[PDB]
């Protein structure tokens, strides 16, 4: 709760069984909680009944054991060095999961990130990583200036453009700067529409939005985010938050995706 | 700039704010409207707690955004 | 000498440095005035990201020169 590597465990009635989800009190462990809450909801990791407090060390130990036990998709007597590489690069990034994980979104697709060691952790676990920071094709200004650029490319392109002689570039600069400013919460209406359609019914996934990672699922063609803030630790019937607009105006739902009241 | 604060009781508070306003300022403004002390207020946006010492701008909170207020 | 650092927010930090200072050293100084982690910080000057081990002198960063600070997107 108070000390910086301690989390409150919240038990919820998930699909017939008391199931733990880990809550967050301070910024930093959202990537670790997003993964660990998926492993707990799939019963791939189990906690002693009514454990109340868990540490970073315990979560990392469980996650490490899960990663090291993944087998390659194709079974071979030899080689599989590419798979072994993914695992070692996943083990090196593991500790950053408690303190904060770097991502580089591209604005072209809900699954589009620069492939980096950080991405590997989700890939090896078969966990989809999504984002809804999508440039609207009906803003062809933004589509032309933003292009196939990642976030990291685009903030540099903005700096170059501001110092350009070429008025075509100065203008590209302004449109991109204006994209980043109006979509600063990192979710567009187009992203939300594309994400709702691409996500798989019943599948658990990680969602990056506003410098935060959430556990996400899709039920009855609708997106939901797991509620992890410790402020809801005592609210058994507050489990899932609807994701159906970009301004945070959500409905709380119980374990079974039924509206909850207080 | 106008934002909304939804409690669990189902009540919606409207506030007038600036992006440069601190979370501490926003809690003061909630005390004005509902007389709830800042120290009993926890603000949350898009699932992440908004902490004291940072601004609305720091958390990319734009006009017509909804925050959640809990004990 | 005194250099300037422009964030995308618009505010500007002033630093005292020597041409002999490493980029790591300037990221460290930035972690004070603004509290930001060095591994989140990216420094741009005349079209290049500055590498940690290089010196200000290596990139001909003179007195009154302006650097650009852009952050990595970090989820917490």
Numbering used by the authors:
A (entry chain A): 108 to 369
B (entry chain H): 1 to 71
C (entry chain D): 1 to 76
Manuscript text:
MINDY1 and MINDY2 are members of the MINDY family of deubiquitinases (DUBs) that have exquisite specificity for cleaving K48-polyUb, yet we have a poor understanding of their catalytic mechanism. Here, we analyze the crystal structures of MINDY1 and MINDY2 alone and in complex with monoUb, di-, and penta-K48-polyUb, identifying 5 distinct Ub binding sites in the catalytic domain that explain how these DUBs sense both Ub chain length and linkage type to cleave K48-polyUb chains. The activity of MINDY1/2 is inhibited by the Cys-loop, and we find that substrate interaction relieves autoinhibition to activate these DUBs. We also find that MINDY1/2 use a non-canonical catalytic triad composed of Cys-His-Thr.
To understand the structural basis for the specific cleavage of K48-linked chains by MINDY1, we determined the crystal structures of catalytically dead mutants of MINDY1cat and MINDY2cat bound to K48-linked diUb, MINDY1C137A:K48-Ub2, and MINDY2C266A:K48-Ub2, respectively. The crystal structure of MINDY1C137A:K48-Ub2 complex reveals how MINDY1cat has extensive interactions with both the proximal Ub (Ubprox) and distal Ub (Ubdist) to precisely position the scissile bond across the catalytic site. Ubdist binds to the S1 site in MINDY1 with a buried surface area of only ∼750 Å2, a binding interface much smaller than those of other DUBs such as HAUSP/USP7 (1,700 Å2), USP21 (1,700 Å2), or USP2 (1,900 Å2), which rely more on Ubdist binding for activity (Hu et al., 2002; Renatus et al., 2006; Ye et al., 2011). Indeed, Ubprox has a slightly larger binding interface compared to Ubdist and binds with a buried surface area of ∼965 Å2. The I44 patch on Ubdist primarily contacts I266 on MINDY1, and further interactions with Ubdist are mediated by V210, W240, Y258, and F315, which form a binding pocket for L73 of Ubdist. The I44 patch of Ubprox mainly contacts F339 on MINDY1. The binding of Ubprox at the S1′ site is further supported by additional cation-π interactions between Ubprox F45 and MINDY1 R316, hydrogen bonds between the side chains of N317 and Ubprox N60 and the backbone of Y59, and ionic interactions between Ubprox R42 and MINDY1 D336. Comparing the structures of the MINDY1C137A:K48-Ub2 complex with MINDY1apo does not show any large-scale conformational changes induced within the catalytic domain upon Ub binding (RMSD 1 Å over 244 aligned Cα atoms). The only significant change is in the Cys loop that undergoes significant remodeling, during which several hydrogen bonds are broken, accompanied by the formation of new bonds. In the active state observed in the MINDY1C137A: K48-Ub2 complex, N134 and the catalytic H319 both form hydrogen bonds with K48 and Q131 interacts with the isopeptide bond.
